[PDB]
Design a binder for this molecule. Structure first.
Ligand SMILES: Cc1cn([C@H]2C[C@H](O)[C@@H](COP(=O)(O)OP(=O)(O)O)O2)c(=O)[nH]c1=O
Ligand SMILES: Cc1cn([C@H]2C[C@H](O)[C@@H](COP(=O)(O)OP(=O)(O)O)O2)c(=O)[nH]c1=O
Ligand SMILES: Cc1cn([C@H]2C[C@H](O)[C@@H](COP(=O)(O)OP(=O)(O)O)O2)c(=O)[nH]c1=O
Ligand SMILES: Cc1cn([C@H]2C[C@H](O)[C@@H](COP(=O)(O)OP(=O)(O)O)O2)c(=O)[nH]c1=O
Lengths: 380, 388, 391, 392
């Protein structure tokens, strides 16, 4: 299902390298796809190959040793290709990819003081040396920096083989994101990921129990604000490519199956057109919103608040559309293929479980999406 | 939960109610073993033994032949909903007993004269707890043939046979070969030589339903043990309804369960964001539609179930048509209710072990079941509307 | 049409069957006039006279007080469905008569001591074919208020809107606030056509239901004698009951409309021969939704009939018990009756887009259900969510 | 409106911008005349006269030939969106001119050698404001034939839903040609040809201002110098999908605009109305989401059409499909969601909008016309799209 202002071909030469680089892992990812789901395990042997070949440095700037992909359009594109084979992997890789871009931004436009830190991190990631995961969602109480760090985060995809965590916290005497090494004392990685889908993503819990952190590794974060919407967009929007990829994958499998099969009954034609029509909408909506985030990513010239809303609002329309239609496309695909797809090991079963992850992801889920977008529309 | 007048809320027959009362003592256990039974994808045998022994598996055996005399598809569907609200897999398995009682009963009272004694025998054994009978219907890897110097040979494979593990007999649909080709349903004992039951069940959901494969490799069958079945007719549609319609109960019960789980969760949080009110209304509206459309189709099937009196082809269409409309609605709205419940609860529901996960997964099974899936349903229903 | 076992298919009561048999002779005429009544947006008086004189408008008056004795919301809805298949705007007007029958009959048997004779009189006149009674419910241009003049007489001031069938009425039950002295209370005064200060406007221009004559009435200092209830902003759930009784049978109208759209499109499709892949899927989805509508509305009507004359339990719960099914049904009907009609029009194609085409009329008529109170979508969501959540 | 980056918000070409500015001056009158034109079902002749005399009916005529050189379907859709926000039937009528500019341009540059001088003539006449050309396409009461004698030409039949036919000076008539084997053709017939009758029978539920009347051709004399060639009947030719796109795709802007109008009216009303009940926030979010979809989806399909409009370099059957396919996904999405959005707006405003003279009533009636327009309605759309997908 081809689209023009679509998520179909890369916009930048850099991004184009990444897709070419990524081409060699597809047959592999596909090949292990089942076991990783069955066991809910991140494919480490594979992540090393890719780290060592400089995939994990994709969004790291040219100068600091990365491939210099600086386009969310292109990141999303790459995640879609992966997601079509293993979406939990895509979900894991996103953490790095986005981390590449969030860091680049701080390096150039952030607090005067924290540019060197960003630079180290970015340069490290470029060397194929750091694997970084933001750890955001607090569980059983909130997570506390006092420097000694105490707390527990949840669903940190890829923490299994991460070398450092960027950790959202409340600093106590306001807000901050200490960068904490894997090898730090009093840090634990839990083996508790039991997702219905996204299982190869290893979204495990992390415990901080009186962990050391030097001020040389603290990035500050405002106070416990519309301009922040921009960062929130930058860090999540390419995840939308994942679900588009899942949808395309379902479609391929079903079209293949239907083609070797018949024959085209009346139910089959209608549903196929329904599927391709949504797929088309998914591509154009997602690409539009990505175009917006990319255009504004590096433009701090205007009013920074309206700049924030300008990035989030489309992101949120797209997410609303994706969370509704990517699930529906997958469902209709499973329907067209039939019972064989119900078997848990079958690729559609995996895609059906995988695709349902998107709707809880923040910002925003359905409830909070409604709040935001109606407020945009109503003023009240 | 959501209330309807001609809904699936209350039993219509006193026999129906006795069953609901009997099933009540098992709900707590089904609920407790729900999770492990899901993880391991294992039928809960002990519980089946308890139910068998205590008389439940003979629920739809007429009171004269030693069963509980539930002759209502409506009340069976209702029973199935309740069970399905704690474990949809076991409901799917118990359906096999319940529908069998009813189809056998039809054969006992309305089938070919030679077939009746055999239907009587099977019914008595079910009522006595000595017969757990499954229908082996779906061919895999070739089709299944019975061949006839008088004596019978059975050769084939069947897939997705719920409860096949603890069954004592199977009723296997086949081609019969020598006349030209006729269809037939022999009753084949679990211990019949050449028969292998296969532990290959790994469904996304319905995992406790034990829907495994059976292989028949030169199995011997008696001439006095064959149930006769036409040839490869709209009058047959009636039978196709009796043996499946009650399953619509399973999904309504699933959606009822999801709705219970979510409301409890929202009542706990005492928010009421503007998305939450809209969804909850829309969920409840759909439940109301499911409840009424499914009961209506059930009521029609019960009314014609014992009425052989006009045109039999017409009678067939008249039972299958409402059945198919309700299935279509259930298959769309069941999943939709469950999805919206899951959305309302949020992330905790995506944990595979969580009850919503298990319902999200279980509820998707209905759309594949025949008669009919979406595509054949459309054909059937458009045919009934266009005459073409 | 489409065949549901507990659908809106056959009547549940003998008086119900009398009504259906009576309505037959008008079906040809309603159909014939349909296109003109629509184009002109004019209630067909000649026809209402026929029907008045032959006993129709007394359908829901009890047998004793000279009526047909129809007591079943099921059977009224059925009847409205039949009418609505030919002219929905007419069905809509008639509902005004039918519901009033039921509401008065309730008041007759169960209102306070003082009210029962007024009910009796009002029913008897309906029975004789002499009273034609309308509810004037919705305010426009401010609210409608009833006050005591300092001379002990009563004053009624305000404006009502969308009053179906008002133009040929002899009586209006007018919803007002009673303002005195005391706190504000609610009153439903009964006011004669000729009460001076009352004007029936000619201002009905709906995109559909054009034949329903839903005009405005001005109440310009209108006299009401000390003779002819509740309190505003006050949760009174037991009252939800009469609100159900007075509106639910309207759902039959939109079912009738969808059945018609279906019949029309199927006729065309058979006429057309070949059945393409989009047609089949659409036909199936149409019939399925039809199936849903028939069973959901029948279900809610059944609940209302079961409880209409049952006042034995907790009356607030009785109220909720009647409204909740009504409102599921209403939500489903307002989505799917519109849907089905659209699809019927899609199947038939360009010819149905011409304004005079019967499908254009049904496309327009069916859009009216969604606005009707109780409840439009937004209050529907508020009500049913409050029911589900407990707050 | 609701904002998308590659949405239908901004023009892409300088001619598109000049077209858009030129249109802002008619927007007030359109709006003022909106209710009358609808009630009476009358095409605003006068307003068309100003627009013709004033350069606008030749917007898509190239500059070299006297017009404004608007080459972009994206920009044409944009213009139609703007107009449709005030009066969709007027937008619908104008599209006859706009699309004719583009299609004639192609024939001028790429039709058969014998076609091009005829094309050039018609474009110059449009640019000069002397010609107003309608496509009379859809048959009613039999099919429409042009028979070739001595070599003279007679045209017999009926056309319908010829929007803007009443102020036309020429028609380009879809016909079967008989003699030589059975060809397809498009004779160019002048207003004042004998035997030609423009009826006044337009009674649409919506698009009431569009003047979509029937025409009757009764033994009409068409000269040999003036017959555009069109290929052959029944013969599947996917290259033809290119043209079929070019002459219809910009219509999609109308329903975007209509939906965007309903949204303006509803929000205004809700914002005036104060509080937000829990149903309102949700409907508002879904309205907005759907409009976001429609903008990006329609804009994508227009872009595709623009990229292929002049590039005839590969397989032309492939080119056609590459054009018709996104078109049809978009039409599918628009025919669904513009209708839904307008429904939901009308739900949000309440009973007032149910009054036939209310603007939302006009939009509700108007927006439903999209679903019937060919290519394709839903069923033909399903056939085409499933065929592209299954290869069968
Ligand atoms: C504002 C902005 C932030 N970001 C990133 C930088 C950080 O990694 C992250 C957090 O937002 P940031 O603006 O740095 O937080 P604060 O406002 O509290 O200082 O978002 C972008 O990538 N692009 C942007 O335009
Ligand atoms: C016709 C009919 C069949 N059946 C059952 C009996 C069989 O188990 C099954 C298939 O039988 P079928 O060959 O359709 O008809 P018959 O039972 O008369 O040979 O359906 C009913 O329960 N009710 C009915 O009305
Ligand atoms: C309570 C109730 C009222 N009604 C009718 C009678 C009246 O016309 C109307 C109002 O009833 P009532 O309970 O008297 O309330 P109020 O006079 O304050 O509006 O509803 C029923 O038909 N059935 C019922 O059970
Ligand atoms: C092939 C093609 C045709 N057209 C136009 C020119 C003519 O007005 C019209 C007829 O050309 P043709 O391709 O013969 O048929 P169709 O009407 O099916 O497209 O289509 C284009 O504008 N662009 C194109 O790429």
């Amino acid at each position: 299902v081809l689209a023009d202002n679509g998520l179909c071909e890369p916009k930048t030469p850099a991004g184009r390298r990444l897709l070419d680089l990524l081409e060699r892992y597809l047959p592999a990812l596909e090949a292990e796809s089942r076991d990783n789901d069955r066991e809910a395990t991140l494919p480490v042997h594979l992540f090393d190959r890719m780290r060592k070949e400089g995939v994990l440095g994709a969004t790291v700037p040219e100068d600091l040793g990365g491939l210099g992909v600086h386009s969310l359009h292109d990141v999303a594109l790459a995640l879609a290709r992966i997601a079509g084979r293993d979406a939990g992997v895509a979900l894991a890789l996103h953490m790095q990819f986005s981390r590449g871009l969030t860091l680049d931004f701080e390096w150039r436009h952030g607090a005067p003081s924290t540019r060197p830190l960003a630079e180290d991190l970015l340069r490290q990631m470029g060397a194929g040396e750091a694997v970084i995961c933001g750890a955001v969602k607090d569980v059983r109480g909130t997570t506390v920096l006092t420097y000694r760090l105490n707390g527990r985060k949840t669903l940190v995809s890829m923490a299994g083989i991460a070398t450092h965590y960027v950790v959202s916290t409340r600093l106590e005497e306001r807000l901050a994101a200490p960068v904490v090494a894997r090898t730090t004392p009093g840090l634990t990685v839990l083996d508790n990921w039991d997702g219905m889908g996204m299982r190869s993503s290893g979204s495990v819990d992390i415990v901080f129990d009186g962990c050391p952190v030097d001020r040389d590794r603290v990035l500050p974060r405002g106070e416990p604000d519309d301009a922040a919407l921009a960062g929130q967009t930058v860090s999540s929007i390419a995840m939308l490519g994942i679900y588009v990829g899942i949808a395309e994958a379902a479609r391929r499998i079903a079209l293949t199956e239907l083609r070797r099969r018949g024959g085209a009954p009346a139910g089959v034609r209608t549903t196929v057109a329904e599927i391709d029509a949504r797929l088309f909408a998914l591509h154009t909506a997602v690409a539009s919103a990505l175009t917006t985030a990319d255009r504004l990513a590096d433009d701090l010239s205007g009013d920074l608040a309206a700049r924030g809303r300008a990035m989030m609002t489309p992101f949120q329309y797209a997410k609303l559309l994706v969370n509704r239609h990517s699930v529906g496309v997958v469902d209709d695909c499973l329907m067209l293929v039939g019972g064989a797809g119900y078997s848990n090991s079958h690729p559609l079963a995996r895609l059906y479980r995988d695709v349902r992850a998107g709707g809880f992801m923040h910002p925003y889920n359905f409830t909070d999406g409604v709040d935001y977008l109606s407020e945009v529309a109503l003023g009240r």
